Design a protein around this nucleic acid. Structure first.
Ligand code: MG
Lengths: 452, 411
DNA sequence: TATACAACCTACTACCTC
RNA sequence: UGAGGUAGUAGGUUGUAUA
């Protein structure tokens, strides 16, 4: 028999300096940390899209209940939770006629239809942004049903060109009862989860409008956190491999910084998911200067993690550019290595947080599983564990595992208990997906509002 | 210095928890039935300061709230205060003209539109009427939330034993052989499609055997056994310094795992199981005619999904770093008649995802264990005939794990 | 440039929602 | 694209050993 150690779940810091574990439960009792006075919305869609959006925005002003309020907590309402005013009356509207949509989607092509639709929506948004007096914080693109049947990434990149926050909302999400189809049953019924949809939409809107929902408190001061993800831009001419990063360091005191580190550094080879010495030096220097500009001092340790191994050709450059006594640690997080642990007695899966330590440099973290607080499973069937390996450098495995849970506890795009992998990798992948569809953007913004 | 809240028990509950914790956060001692019969009547009389009643369709006719309201009215008629009862309207299907007596003459607060406005006006009313208070202690509204609502939802120091799918190898063949067999094996013969596990690896000295007798496939029978090289499978593993210029110790283990994964595939060809092809591996399943009542040891491995039949299938793969194991992965293979496979590859995904939604830890465990035990010849092992005299033995019982922190299973 | 094999890497589609 | 998860289907690279 082999023993599995347990890692206590991390705690996130909400308003008033109080700690909790579930964001859905900590936002209701205490609330967000910062004060934004209100969200002035903007809609770019058909007039029926405007009606749907206003109906939904009026519906979410009052409490909404789920079927199970232990697994899925209820929603008090936007103003009760966040202390803001996101009303359905201070709404700026830019209409798209059905004639334009039909003209641009009738036959055309595929790469021509998508380009034309993106041009139409972006022309409306950018024109409203540059020549108008009314201030709009978040732009809500209500996409009809015939448009979503590639567009999202193009829209986000071509708006990234001008740094405008945006949120795409299909009409099936907000009016799921009307789009019956089939033989009388909705294609996606939300009847039992209507308190989770409101939670997720509200938290996304709050974050994209300059708000700070929660923050991490249990992480080592001084150390950085970089996550490298490689994407194949090889779909176009001159096949290459682009790399993207994301940094999560802590402020000089009582703060959390979570941005991107982009400028994607390419690789001319085909299967070489690695980096050249000069590009590695540039990446490390940029990250270190980003940390030093905020904390007015150099880091104490750099914690680089990725889904792939690190060769000796890049680590030498990394050590060449690192100054003073800034240590470096390389970690590799594989996801689908075939090890499944069952339970001898019971129909419920293994608890989340169990770690099986193979060697001093390897471990088996369990991120998905059974959460006692929700009394339900975070996944389906038997959960799969992630594999953590200290590739390059010297560090303790337990500290690495604690840091992995801490990173897992930082998803702003959705309001859930936790994820199944560190959020830095996921956000870097999102950034890479956005930047691949673009056309040679120079010095992109480092804020997740424009990407997420 | 207290505040009393009356409400229905099964309904109008979430509002009461929210309001109670919010008022405790700001420093208002509240006495609600959620946090904790004569005690209620004593608190309405000698302790409470403001009596709040929740109005709803579910309420407005419940006995307990009515009795508490009557007691509160009697206390109000003696305390000489006209603001002792403050109704809160938390419904939208009950009119303002259907409210019961004794409260129908009092102006409500209308929590109907939005709860934040109601809370703000409630606090303004409390500040105007000089309700006593203490400095805001936001910690307590977290402490009570943890104590009361999260009492049974935590991590217990409970011990459980966890099964796994890593079936270990008890014993290995003693000698790994390096035969020459020059000019007695054509350069065009594939070393695969041969009865025994063999591969042409390493600078000649090819045809890795683990046993002799590749006769009737390569009839030469004219080999001088002296030139053949023999290594020890004990030093090939555990870094026993088998690393030589002939073959280093890393390539040797990658070379053995190949023989294991070939031995499994050629052994399953002799059992009562058929094969299915996947993207990068093979899966084996049992037909419908075999097995009595479709159950091996009271565990069913084939059934019916509407007009189709479903089979349980497993794969395998060698591994050697932690310990010599055989990682088994579970699959479901769908057929049409019960013996004839379905050539779709597009409906089998939509049937696998359909069938695997009702299956949980128990079903997966029992079906995997039953399928593994079905193949075994010996009671506690399964035989892979790598050779005419040597074999690889895998345990029937998978590796077991155990922990010290756990949870109480739901009913 | 090509056959076979272990070990890793990515990128799409399609169906469930506890 | 409100989100999370589970699978399947395709490929590719390295490392030997052959051509
Ligand atoms: Mg989003």
């Amino acid at each position: 028999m082999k023993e599995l150690i347990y890692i206590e779940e991390p705690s996130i810091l909400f308003a008033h300096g109080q700690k909790c574990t579930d964001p859905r439960d900590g936002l209701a009792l205490f609330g967000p940390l910062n004060q934004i006075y209100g969200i002035k919305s903007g809609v770019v869609g058909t007039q029926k899209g405007l009606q749907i959006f206003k109906s939904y925005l009026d519906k979410i002003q009052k409490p909404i209940y789920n079927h199970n309020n232990i697994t899925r907590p209820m929603f008090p309402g936007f103003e009760a939770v966040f202390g803001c005013k996101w009303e359905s009356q201070n709404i700026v509207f830019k209409e798209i006629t059905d004639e334009e949509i039909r003209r641009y989607l009738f036959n055309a092509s595929t790469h021509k239809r998508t380009y034309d639709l993106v041009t139409l929506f972006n022309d409306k948004i950018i024109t409203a942004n540059k020549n108008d007096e009314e201030r709009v914080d978040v732009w809500f693109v209500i996409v009809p049903e015939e448009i979503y049947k590639q567009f999202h990434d193009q829209l986000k990149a071509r708006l990234l060109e001008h740094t405008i926050p945006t949120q795409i909302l299909r009409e099936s999400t907000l009016a799921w009862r009307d789009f019956k189809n089939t033989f009388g049953a909705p294609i996606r019924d939300f009847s039992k989860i209507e308190g989770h949809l409101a939670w997720t939409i509200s938290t996304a809107a709050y974050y994209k409008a300059g708000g700070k929902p929660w923050k991490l408190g249990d992480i080592r001061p001084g150390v950085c956190y970089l996550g490298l993800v490689y994407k194949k831009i090889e779909k176009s001419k001159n096949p290459q491999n682009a790399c993207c990063a994301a940094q999560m360091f802590l402020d000089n005191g009582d703060g959390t910084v979570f941005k991107g580190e982009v400028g994607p550094w390419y690789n001319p080879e085909k299967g070489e998911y690695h980096l050249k010495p000069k590009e590695a030096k540039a990446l490390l220097t940029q990250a270190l200067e980003s940390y030093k500009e905020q904390n007015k001092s150099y880091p104490k340790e750099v914690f680089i993690h990725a889904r792939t191994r690190f060769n000796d050709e890049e680590w030498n450059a990394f050590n060449e550019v690192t100054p003073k006594n800034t240590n470096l640690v390389g970690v590799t997080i594989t996801k689908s290595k075939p090890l499944k642990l069952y339970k001898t007695e019971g129909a419920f899966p293994i608890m989340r947080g169990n770690a099986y330590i193979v060697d001093e440099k390897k471990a088996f973290l369990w991120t998905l599983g059974f959460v006692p607080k929700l009394q339900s499973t975070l996944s389906m069937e038997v959960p799969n564990p992630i594999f953590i390996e200290i590739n390059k450098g010297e560090a303790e495995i337990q500290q690495v595992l604690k840091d992995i849970l801490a990173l897992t506890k930082l998803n702003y795009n959705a309001c859930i208990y936790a994820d199944g992998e560190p959020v830095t990798l996921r956000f870097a992948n999102k950034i890479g997906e956005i930047l691949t569809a673009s056309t040679e953007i120079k010095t992109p913004p480092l804020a997740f509002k424009y990407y997420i | 210095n207290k505040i009393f809240i009356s409400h229905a028990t099964p309904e109008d509950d979430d509002f009461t928890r929210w309001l109670s914790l919010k008022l405790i956060g700001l420093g208002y001692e509240v006495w609600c039935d959620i946090l904790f019969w004569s005690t209620i009547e004593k608190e309405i009389r000698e302790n409470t300061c403001k009596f709040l009643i929740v109005s709803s369709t579910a309420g407005n006719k419940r006995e307990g709230v009515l009795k508490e309201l009557a007691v509160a009215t009697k206390v109000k008629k003696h305390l000489q205060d006209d603001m002792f009862i403050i109704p809160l309207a938390i419904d939208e299907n009950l009119s303002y003209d259907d409210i019961n007596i004794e409260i129908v003459r009092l102006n409500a607060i209308d929590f109907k539109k939005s709860w934040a406005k109601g809370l703000q006006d409630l606090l303004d009313a409390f500040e105007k009427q000089n309700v006593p208070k203490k400095p805001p202690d936001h910690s307590k509204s977290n402490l009570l939330y943890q104590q009361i609502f999260l009492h049974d939802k935590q991590a217990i120091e409970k011990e459980e034993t966890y099964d796994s799918n890593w079936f270990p190898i008890i014993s290995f063949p003693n000698e790994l052989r390096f035969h020459r067999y020059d000019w007695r094996l054509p350069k065009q013969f594939d070393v695969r499609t041969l009865a025994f596990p063999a591969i042409r690896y390493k600078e000649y000295l090819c045809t890795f055997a683990w046993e002799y007798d590749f006769i009737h496939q390569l009839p030469k029978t004219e080999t001088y056994n002296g030139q053949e090289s023999i290594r020890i499978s004990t030093s090939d593993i555990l870094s026993g310094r088998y690393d030589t210029d002939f073959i280093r110790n890393y390539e040797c283990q990658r070379l053995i795992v190949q023989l294991i994964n070939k031995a499994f595939e050629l052994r399953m060809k002799d059992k009562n199981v058929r094969e299915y092809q996947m993207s990068k591996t093979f899966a084996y399943w049992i037909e419908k005619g075999k097995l009595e009542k479709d159950k091996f040891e009271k565990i069913k491995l084939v059934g019916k999904q509407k007009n189709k039949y479903w089979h349980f299938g497993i794969s395998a793969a060698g591994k050697l770093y932690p310990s010599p194991v055989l990682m088994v992965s579970s699959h479901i293979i769908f057929t049409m008649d019960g013996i004839n496979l379905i050539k779709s590859k597009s409906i089998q995904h939509s049937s696998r995802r359909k069938q695997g939604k009702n299956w949980w830890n128990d079903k997966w465990r029992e079906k995997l264990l039953a399928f593994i035990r079905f193949l075994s010849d010996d009671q506690n092992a399964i035989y892979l005939n790598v050779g005419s005299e040597e074999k690889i033995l895998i345990s029937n019982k998978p590796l077991k794990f155990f922990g010290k922190m756990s949870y109480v299973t739901p009913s």
